[PDB]
Amino acid sequence: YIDLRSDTVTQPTDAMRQCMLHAEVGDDVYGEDPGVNALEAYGADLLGKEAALFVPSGTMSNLLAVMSHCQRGEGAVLGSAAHIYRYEAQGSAVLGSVALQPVPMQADGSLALADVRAAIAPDDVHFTPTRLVCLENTHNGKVLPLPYLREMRELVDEHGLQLHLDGARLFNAVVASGHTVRELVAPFDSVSICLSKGLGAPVGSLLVGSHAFIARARRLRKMVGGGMRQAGILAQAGLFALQQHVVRLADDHRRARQLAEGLAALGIRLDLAQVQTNMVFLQLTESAPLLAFMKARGILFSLRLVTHLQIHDDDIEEVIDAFTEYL
Amino acid sequence: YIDLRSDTVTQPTDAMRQCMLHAEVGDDVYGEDPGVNALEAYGADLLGKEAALFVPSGTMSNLLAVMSHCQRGEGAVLGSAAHIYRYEAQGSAVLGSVALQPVPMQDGSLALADVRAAIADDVHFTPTRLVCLENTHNGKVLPLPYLREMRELVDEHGLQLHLDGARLFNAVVASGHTVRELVAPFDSVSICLSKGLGAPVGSLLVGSHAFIARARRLRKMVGGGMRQAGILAQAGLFALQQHVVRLADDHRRARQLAEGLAALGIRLDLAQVQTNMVFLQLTSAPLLAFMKARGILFSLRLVTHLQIHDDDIEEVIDAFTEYL
Amino acid sequence: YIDLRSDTVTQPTDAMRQCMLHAEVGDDVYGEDPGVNALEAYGADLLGKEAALFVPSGTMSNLLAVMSHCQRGEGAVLGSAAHIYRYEAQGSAVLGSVALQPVPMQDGSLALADVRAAIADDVHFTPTRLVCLENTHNGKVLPLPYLREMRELVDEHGLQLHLDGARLFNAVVASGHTVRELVAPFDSVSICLSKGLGAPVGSLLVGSHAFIARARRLRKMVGGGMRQAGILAQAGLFALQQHVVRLADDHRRARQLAEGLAALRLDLAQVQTNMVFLQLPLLAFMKARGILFSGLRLVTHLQIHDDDIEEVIDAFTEY
Amino acid sequence: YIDLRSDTVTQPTDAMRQCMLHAEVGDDVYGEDPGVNALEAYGADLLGKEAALFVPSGTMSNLLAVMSHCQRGEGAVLGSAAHIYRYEAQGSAVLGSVALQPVPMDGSLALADVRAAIAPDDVHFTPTRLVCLENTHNGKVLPLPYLREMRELVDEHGLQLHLDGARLFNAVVASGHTVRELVAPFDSVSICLSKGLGAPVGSLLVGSHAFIARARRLRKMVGGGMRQAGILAQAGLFALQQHVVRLADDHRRARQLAEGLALPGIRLDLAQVQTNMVFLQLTSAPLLAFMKARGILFSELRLVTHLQIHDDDIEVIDAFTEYL
Numbered sequence A: 001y002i003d004l005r006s007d008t009v010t011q012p013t014d015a016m017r018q019c020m021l022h023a024e025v026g027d028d029v030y031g032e033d034p035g036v037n038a039l040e041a042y043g044a045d046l047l048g049k050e051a052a053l054f055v056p057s058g059t060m061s062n063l064l065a066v067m068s069h070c071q072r073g074e075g076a077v078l079g080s081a082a083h084i085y086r087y088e089a090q091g092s093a094v095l096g097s098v099a100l101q102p103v104p105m106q107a108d109g110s111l112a113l114a115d116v117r118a119a120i121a122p123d124d125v126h127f128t129p130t131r132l133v134c135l136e137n138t139h140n141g142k143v144l145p146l147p148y149l150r151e152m153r154e155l156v157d158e159h160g161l162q163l164h165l166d167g168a169r170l171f172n173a174v175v176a177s178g179h180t181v182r183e184l185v186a187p188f189d190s191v192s193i194c195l196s197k198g199l200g201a202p203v204g205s206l207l208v209g210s211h212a213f214i215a216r217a218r219r220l221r222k223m224v225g226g227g228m229r230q231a232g233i234l235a236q237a238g239l240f241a242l243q244q245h246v247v248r249l250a251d252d253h254r255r256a257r258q259l260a261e262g263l264a265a266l267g268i269r270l271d272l273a274q275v276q277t278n279m280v281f282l283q284l285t286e287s288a289p290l291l292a293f294m295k296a297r298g299i300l301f302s303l304r305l306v307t308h309l310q311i312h313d314d315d316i317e318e319v320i321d322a323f324t325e326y327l
Numbered sequence B: 001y002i003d004l005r006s007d008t009v010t011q012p013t014d015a016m017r018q019c020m021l022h023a024e025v026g027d028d029v030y031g032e033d034p035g036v037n038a039l040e041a042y043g044a045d046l047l048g049k050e051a052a053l054f055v056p057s058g059t060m061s062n063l064l065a066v067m068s069h070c071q072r073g074e075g076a077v078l079g080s081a082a083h084i085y086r087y088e089a090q091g092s093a094v095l096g097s098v099a100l101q102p103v104p105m106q107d108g109s110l111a112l113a114d115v116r117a118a119i120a121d122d123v124h125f126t127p128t129r130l131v132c133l134e135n136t137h138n139g140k141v142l143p144l145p146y147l148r149e150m151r152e153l154v155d156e157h158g159l160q161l162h163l164d165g166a167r168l169f170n171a172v173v174a175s176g177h178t179v180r181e182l183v184a185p186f187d188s189v190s191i192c193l194s195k196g197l198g199a200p201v202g203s204l205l206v207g208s209h210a211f212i213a214r215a216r217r218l219r220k221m222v223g224g225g226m227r228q229a230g231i232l233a234q235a236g237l238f239a240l241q242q243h244v245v246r247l248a249d250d251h252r253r254a255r256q257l258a259e260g261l262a263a264l265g266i267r268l269d270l271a272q273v274q275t276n277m278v279f280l281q282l283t284s285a286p287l288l289a290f291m292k293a294r295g296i297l298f299s300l301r302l303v304t305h306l307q308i309h310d311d312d313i314e315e316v317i318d319a320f321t322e323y324l
Numbered sequence C: 001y002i003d004l005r006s007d008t009v010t011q012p013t014d015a016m017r018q019c020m021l022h023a024e025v026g027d028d029v030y031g032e033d034p035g036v037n038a039l040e041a042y043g044a045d046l047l048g049k050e051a052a053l054f055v056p057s058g059t060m061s062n063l064l065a066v067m068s069h070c071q072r073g074e075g076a077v078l079g080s081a082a083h084i085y086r087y088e089a090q091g092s093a094v095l096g097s098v099a100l101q102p103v104p105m106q107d108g109s110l111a112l113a114d115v116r117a118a119i120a121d122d123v124h125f126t127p128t129r130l131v132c133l134e135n136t137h138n139g140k141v142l143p144l145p146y147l148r149e150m151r152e153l154v155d156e157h158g159l160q161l162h163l164d165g166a167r168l169f170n171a172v173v174a175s176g177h178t179v180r181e182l183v184a185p186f187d188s189v190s191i192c193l194s195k196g197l198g199a200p201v202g203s204l205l206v207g208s209h210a211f212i213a214r215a216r217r218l219r220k221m222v223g224g225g226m227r228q229a230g231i232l233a234q235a236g237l238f239a240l241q242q243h244v245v246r247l248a249d250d251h252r253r254a255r256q257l258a259e260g261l262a263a264l265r266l267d268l269a270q271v272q273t274n275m276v277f278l279q280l281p282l283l284a285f286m287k288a289r290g291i292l293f294s295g296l297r298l299v300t301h302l303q304i305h306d307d308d309i310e311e312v313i314d315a316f317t318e319y
Numbered sequence D: 001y002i003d004l005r006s007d008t009v010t011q012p013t014d015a016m017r018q019c020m021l022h023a024e025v026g027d028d029v030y031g032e033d034p035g036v037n038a039l040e041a042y043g044a045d046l047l048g049k050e051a052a053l054f055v056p057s058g059t060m061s062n063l064l065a066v067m068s069h070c071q072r073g074e075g076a077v078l079g080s081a082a083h084i085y086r087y088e089a090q091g092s093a094v095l096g097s098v099a100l101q102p103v104p105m106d107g108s109l110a111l112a113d114v115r116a117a118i119a120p121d122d123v124h125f126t127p128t129r130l131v132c133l134e135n136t137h138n139g140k141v142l143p144l145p146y147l148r149e150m151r152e153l154v155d156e157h158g159l160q161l162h163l164d165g166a167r168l169f170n171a172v173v174a175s176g177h178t179v180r181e182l183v184a185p186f187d188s189v190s191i192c193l194s195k196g197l198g199a200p201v202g203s204l205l206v207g208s209h210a211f212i213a214r215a216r217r218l219r220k221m222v223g224g225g226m227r228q229a230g231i232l233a234q235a236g237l238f239a240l241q242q243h244v245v246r247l248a249d250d251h252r253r254a255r256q257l258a259e260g261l262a263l264p265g266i267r268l269d270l271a272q273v274q275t276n277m278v279f280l281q282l283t284s285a286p287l288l289a290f291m292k293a294r295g296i297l298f299s300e301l302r303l304v305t306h307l308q309i310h311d312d313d314i315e316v317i318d319a320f321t322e323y324l
């Protein structure tokens, strides 16, 4: 199968599996797993933050993030199109008792400053004390503009709130824009980075932040069930992914460009200008028969096509010709 | 003071105090308060619903309403400008583990496309279970044709419909439709007694037997289980029987207030004044501080009620005329 | 009907109803109700505390109390048989996300050893913030020397101390110690006005300024923010000024009921205030006879007279 | 180090690592990972249940189970000494809004107390929905006759029954009774893989189709929804068919350690020593410091035997003899 459904489907490489073979493990509950400790220390330093926490998913990474910034009743301003609001079953509100404050989100993950400013609650009993603003980079494969970020920071400083980044595909934004992680992450108090997407690690994510923030997140990790034992196997794989699989993301972007240009040339509607990273969003002028046709020819997606490690140049051409055949 | 801040400032009349004086009481926890039992029975009959529940406030009425429709993680669709969403500390979510799903609110109506795009069956999504509307949203009446279409939408997916009817009776007299005609499309209705109707304390959550049985259980948990609430309930009853028709006066006072202020550096639309609210713009802090000194109180918004008279409407008109 | 189910059945006296007729009211949401302000000012001052907050029930008062002490995941240690844990549907846990830590109950006291062992710094545990005590508990009086011990325990571990004084004044009149004395070791106190005191509705939560301010905020979220509650509040103020010393009669009448039945299984040492617990269908016989209670438990109050007490003894001796 | 702190310190064996190297994977969200699918189908079939769910820890397994049985305001009666109540930061209550109802806890919960704990139909109380047992509890085996009596009680009240079987396989090999025999009276069972069995990560929640479906939905909400988890799942599958029978050696070595330690100044009864745990009293802090210096680790004092504890390790006796 040529799988263009998501970049999560990425499988561990032989070099990754060999690193997992020789991965020294310990009990993480006692803080005695050398693999997880090395990953957390590396991740924290890589992003220029104090501490880091290793969790089984990006959902937990975000869930614990919003909960460590917001006590019960406290507010978290985020986009209605953001993964934390719509694709995480509103975990932070249901489980953590936090007040989720959705706000319109643009094609890039930018939330209008006037929308966020009006969402910040005045000190009054009818309202919820807003404490945090959430952002997402990348958002639908789009790169969050850096000058905008610096303005949201000044907005957040004006009200003394906090800033969390859902950076599930942060490194895609890094390699596409030409700005480094340290620069993309500096305006944020905390960031979630997914290892189990483009980077190609089998399981996991990192939550990075200040010593106090992480300490509260770690305590909640135990409560939600994220406290594992010998997770050094998974941690090393993530550590491998973070230092060996970053630069080759340019290929995913390259192949996504090639796929986008090959399909835009055809009864198809897609904006080539929206193709910034490893995602191609397209339309027909419908959908069910297209998917059945493509599945029968060993090709998989769901108007969204996502390139990754397992996808090659010949896969790109095979899918382009399948669309061309569909005519 | 001429108090146009809100209709919640309404004071009990001497006739209402009289009914509160001779109110027969019992222990509501045992279900033995005759004043409470009568209000709830009358409330359920008035709206053509199976059962009703007396509560300390409209916040609790709504708190109990959505929690009784939605269990842990289940979703409720409401307006971003709805009182349940922005003026109730998201209690439904914080205390009740309910997923609040705000959609744009225009008029007070929610676009049918916006509601059904918000309705969700998969692991990433919250299962939607309820839709919330607010009749008399900022003094504006919800159209009955819109209610007719909303019911059919929630019937498709087997969802429930709740009415935040804090000022339902303002809508009833102004639109010229019967109470039952406005509440028929709703499974549950929450009506306030402590606003225009003039009762000192409380609200009524109305719905099915089982729904109210759930709300009643939750009322004890949040701490709304009162004892001899008959004195409050009889007041609410007195209001519901004798203070509904005269709301037509509050509308007229607002109408005379709007037309009287529109004739001046004043920005206000007269098509917004449908009931007892007057929304206004200056073409703000020194404005009300000046009015403070003239014994006139408000906060862009001016609301009429029983304690507001014709001479009070003329005085506030005059004060603005001297101000500009 | 002679109603000995609870002191919650107490009705307003004509004097109280009169004070309600003339009660001055405003909007409590803006803090403009002079009736609720006056009761809050009086209640705070009476117990020697910075502030007070008026709520529609004893359940709300306790709910807000623990939620103001303990945030999500924080612990509150209390008695197994305590009202906050046993009879309030675990609202503070379900709605408030606090960890309730029930400890065995001895007079209604908690063994200091049990409370010490209940205090959690580790990720498997919930960080304790509060201990809860109840006075009176099932009518018995909580010993004053034990209170000072608890405060010393609380000061050692940096915790807070809450009193469920739903029947605090029953303890005050029976023990011979002042309100200030029984309340001084507590950071916060709930007082019910709708029991022995005879007010129709509501309780009062008292504590520090910052505490009440947190409770006032949570009051709005739970739906306890009323409008013209001064009529209810003045009724409570009346009860708190007029109905305290006469509780000694309820105690006396409970004492005389207990002696009339203990002669006829009943422990006379447990009859300390206005409650009588006994043992041996019977309820069906009494209901027809014109007498109501629950079970096991008979509770005297404002509306119960000497003739009532004598009549229920006669109904018991016949059965 | 000789690590007798817990059986959680168990390291993967070379064979287990080899099994993890050639383990086939897929995306678990799409249900396409053959490793976890094989583990879950095998786990469900091993215990005679309909379905199973793979999770990052025993804590999450228990957390989702209580939440899948109990909704908001619903009660679950468990042991005060039980892990779900004592050592899981009351996650079920804090996050899941369920009423934890601890009861005095061989690990059994006295029927009379469980009966007294079940709440009657009233607004003051939380409708009880679940009772939780634990086997093994502190190395002690739950008596099978008592289990059949507990099932009688839960059928009587129409409740669910969950097992925290973190060390269930210790019970099966020590009692002679098979897994299905110990698990049959339970609606849901939670087995750990990262303890005695020696897998690096995870547990299985097993139950009915509908139950596990609900647990799967909640798993996503709490963050247990992994991607390529087949590598962990295969190691769990390996341990489940390769490391069960050898748990007898863990019991044998625990027996020998207890026999050798129960020396003057040491107090312990061997009647409690039934599986892989040894609880022992000195007639404490200075002992830990001394043992650590001699390369022995443990945490009244509990000692736990497991996979990488050898016969000549059970040296610990000599150290105990030298110290006292």
Ligand SMILES: Cc1ncc(COP(=O)(O)O)c(CNCC(=O)O)c1O
Binding pocket: A005, A006, A007, A008, A056, A057, A058, A059, A060, A083, A084, A136, A138, A166, A168, A169, A194, A196, D225
């Ligand atoms: C922006 C973003 N944030 C958080 C998550 C959550 O990660 P987990 O699935 O590991 O919990 C995802 C997964 N997105 C699913 C997809 O693109 O197919 C995501 O795209």
Ligand SMILES: Cc1ncc(COP(=O)(O)O)c(CNCC(=O)O)c1O
Binding pocket: B005, B006, B007, B008, B056, B057, B058, B059, B060, B083, B084, B134, B136, B164, B166, B167, B192, B194, B203, C225
């Ligand atoms: C539409 C609406 N719904 C619910 C409530 C809640 O009622 P309580 O205040 O009794 O909780 C209000 C209060 N009205 C506030 C105002 O407009 O001034 C309201 O206006």
Ligand SMILES: Cc1ncc(COP(=O)(O)O)c(CNCC(=O)O)c1O
Binding pocket: B225, C005, C006, C007, C008, C056, C057, C058, C059, C060, C083, C084, C134, C136, C137, C164, C166, C167, C192, C194, C203
């Ligand atoms: C010690 C104690 N605490 C709190 C409450 C709760 O008060 P409300 O009912 O006003 O919420 C009660 C009432 N329980 C005794 C009875 O009802 O007979 C009580 O006895």
Ligand SMILES: Cc1ncc(COP(=O)(O)O)c(CNCC(=O)O)c1O
Binding pocket: A227, D005, D006, D007, D008, D056, D057, D058, D059, D060, D083, D084, D087, D134, D136, D164, D166, D167, D192, D194, D203
């Ligand atoms: C009976 C029991 N149940 C559940 C758990 C939780 O498992 P996780 O740690 O995988 O969440 C433990 C671990 N108890 C710690 C110990 O005995 O060392 C346990 O002993």
